[PDB]
Amino acid sequence: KKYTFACLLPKHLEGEYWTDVQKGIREAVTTYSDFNISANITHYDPYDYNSFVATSQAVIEEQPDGVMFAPTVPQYTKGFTDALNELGIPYIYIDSQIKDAPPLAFFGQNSHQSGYFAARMLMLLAVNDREIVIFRKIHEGVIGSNQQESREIGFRQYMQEHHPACNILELNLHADLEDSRMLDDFFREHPDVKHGITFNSKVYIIGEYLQQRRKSDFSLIGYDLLERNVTCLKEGTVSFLIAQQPELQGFNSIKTLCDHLIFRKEVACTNYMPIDLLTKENIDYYH
Amino acid sequence: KKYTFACLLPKHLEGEYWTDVQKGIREAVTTYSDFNISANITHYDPYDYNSFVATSQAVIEEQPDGVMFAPTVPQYTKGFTDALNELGIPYIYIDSQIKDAPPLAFFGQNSHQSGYFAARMLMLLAVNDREIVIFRKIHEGVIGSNQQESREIGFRQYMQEHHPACNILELNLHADLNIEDSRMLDDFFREHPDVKHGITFNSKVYIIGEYLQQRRKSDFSLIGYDLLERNVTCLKEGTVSFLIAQQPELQGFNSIKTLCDHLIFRKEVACTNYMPIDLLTKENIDYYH
Ligand code: NA
User: Fold this and answer.
1) Which residue of A has its CA nearest to B113?
2) Under an 8 A CB cutoff, do A282 and B276 touch?
3) What is residue A68's three-state secondary structure?
4) Which of B120, B274, B283 sits opposite A113 (nearest CB)?
5) Gaps in chain A after residue (C–N beyond 2.5 Å)
6) Which residues of A are less than 8 Å from B286 in CB distance?
7) Using CA atoms, how far apart are residues B196 and B190, in angstroms rounded to an integer?
8) Domains of chain B, earliest start first
9) Are A154 and A115 in contact (CB under 8 A)?
10) Which of B124, B145, B111 is nearest to B18 (CA)?
11) CA distance B160 to B151
12) Residue of chain B minimizing CA distance to A285
């Protein structure tokens, strides 16, 4: 019988952030083909905690040899991890982690440090601005991402720490809205804000909006190398993109499971991923 | 018998730039121990022609299967590369390219783009600055490094395209001294009290950074290259604002790997391997690997 590694990740469309993590998973599968391993990828609605509970219970009943997954908020993840620990099934957290429920290994960015870093870079662009804006993506009241929330916290800590006088504005766009009207009104109400940032992976939304309205007097800092994000980076609507090597996170998760289960090797638990800064001038050599 | 790859690098002290490239080479040797290969590292005097010739000749006379070589003063190398081609000994360039003498493969940054990028980052720092300064350190007059010279050209191009009004000052420190580095700096900052931002293209930015630290001067920030320990310390202390890395470990590792699969695995290999232009700050340096 083949090895089965259950991979539980957020629902998404092809080409979005999670596409790269999955390609890393598949690359790992082929690499370890001599061991006949198999990745069974299922998804959950990151905005609906019950979706995580139902799908994670399915994973549990599939009795995989190992599991890698993006945790949702703590209290809705606890039952899953407790069950896996009780069944002796090792799990790996990716993207974010739950510190009081340690896994075999964690692969993701130090969210707080990532946010702190982002603030430092943003202040470099808006050195003497009186306000900056944080764009978010919410649905059913939640932000749907521990990392997106924890990054903002680190960000805010840096701001309160180095630029307490700079006013921080927030605009919560709707996940499955029209982002355009939201933006039109935002700029009408706040016509002098020159710089903004988002902690989700869809800064292109704001970028394309500016590109279309011929607005070149506003630049964004965003996350991840989604095709559309990079286009906005090259066009100038986005000043910097922060990457976390999603492919490597996916690959290393499977490799770690293999190392632990197959090779029976010891493995490092905490694996903070880098906080890579990309600009139009260095993106082409970034791999 | 065995496979022998001669690696010719500039003499240096442990902890300088090349120490990482050497670790890379070592990691590669062990990884391919199966094919029983050995990397023979020899250091050379980069500014003593007669010396360089003697060591290079010694390398050629060792009859190596392959060679990886980091060029400093290209005008002292034609004899070496002609001899390698004549003997059918494939060679790899790292860090700097020597256009009139193409190698089997090259590993290093696209110097032009690296400098262009460096300019962008410096100007984010010196937005409204009338002048900026490039810091260099020459031996026998030469700026000994095509990568360095070329980086400077890309830097000036960006400055011409974006801040043609900004004055570009230059301060040359000398290795074949008796004019001490700190004395050069005192005169410069004395005659140029207003300059607030600077940059260097060699990997010894710590010389300027530690100077500012010991003089508790905090009204000036540098942009430098490479993750030498002294560079990182200056990065963490604030004298240096940004450091640009190029993954020296991987360049050394890849050099040997390329030689192995070319000579041993009879594989095809790309000639140009442009390394990344990584930007590091105090806030992300600890998570870079
Ligand atoms: Na969200």
Assistant:
1) A281
2) yes
3) strand
4) B283
5) 177
6) 113
7) 13
8) 1-109+246-276 (3.40.50.2300), 110-245+277-289 (3.40.50.2300)
9) yes
10) B145
11) 14
12) B276
